[PDB]
Design a protein around this ligand. Structure first.
Ligand SMILES: [Cl-]
Lengths: 166, 166
């Protein structure tokens, strides 16, 4: 599970992150890359690649910041995964949360349902393995940090999720 | 659970099928369409429609014959689903099995690993839901009917699965 595209499959560089997430995690933070969007597996590999390159080469980070990335292709791409503390929501939220990030800018476009489906299924396949709590709370990026992420349109949608909390 | 692309999404004609399966189902039979492959949600949705069409329109079937279709786009396309008897492996096997079909021809080519991951992830969801038995048995199309399906490349692969039984 759960049709997660593994690091090696999207041509990732080697993670160098050591700091580990205490399971089971209470919080999920939903962001956007505010990068280029992609609707094929081929373009979404290329794009996940591009995100990690910025984070690693330019920002000198130990890996891509997000635990997981959602493509409009409808597949989840493995970032730091369930166990490795992210860099997506800053110091107060990074240690106590999983960050998933929709690849693209969602101010003036919604993600297609398969992307929204992928995410929800990703979230379920996280309780199952005990990475997430049963009663996990979903926060928007803007709900924990000064940012427009995850975009006006995607933010509206996640407010309607059963697990969402302001 | 499953991130399955639902009938409405690939724009599938309303099913006319009535006869049910008895849960939990013991057998999964793996086929190929022997037809044109697709590696985008866009072309793969169209392909499900094409296979549905051939089955409904040319063979006068009540619906696409497969319970589920697997795209090379890495997405499961819903057919008859977990509860409805399909038309994929003839009259001995149709009433006691789930039929999943890889959209393509896997005599010369292997399916890309995201296809193989969706298939496996699907079955696990079948078991989760109780549509499939915990001790399900995965069979080749060729293993229960005189055919080439699911093709030797794919057949080779599916023989390496833990639930596979000659
Ligand atoms: Cl970092």
């Amino acid at each position: 599970c759960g049709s997660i595209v593994p690091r090696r499959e999207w041509r990732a560089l080697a993670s160098e992150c050591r700091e580990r997430l205490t399971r089971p995690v209470r919080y999920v933070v939903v962001s956007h890359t505010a990068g280029s969007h992609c609707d094929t597996p081929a373009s979404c590999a290329q794009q996940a690649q591009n995100v990690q390159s910025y984070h690693v080469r330019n920002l000198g980070w130990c890996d891509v910041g997000y635990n997981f990335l959602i493509g409009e292709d409808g597949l989840v791409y493995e970032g730091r995964g369930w166990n490795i503390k992210g860099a997506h929501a800053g110091p107060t939220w990074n240690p106590i949360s999983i960050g998933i990030s929709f690849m693209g800018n969602y101010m003036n476009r919604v993600p297609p349902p398969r992307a929204l489906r992928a995410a929800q299924n990703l979230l379920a396949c996280g309780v199952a393995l005990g990475a997430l709590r049963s009663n996990y709370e979903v926060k928007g990026h803007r709900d924990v940090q000064p940012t427009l992420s995850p975009g006006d349109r995607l933010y509206e949608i996640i407010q309607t999720w059963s697990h969402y909390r302001a």
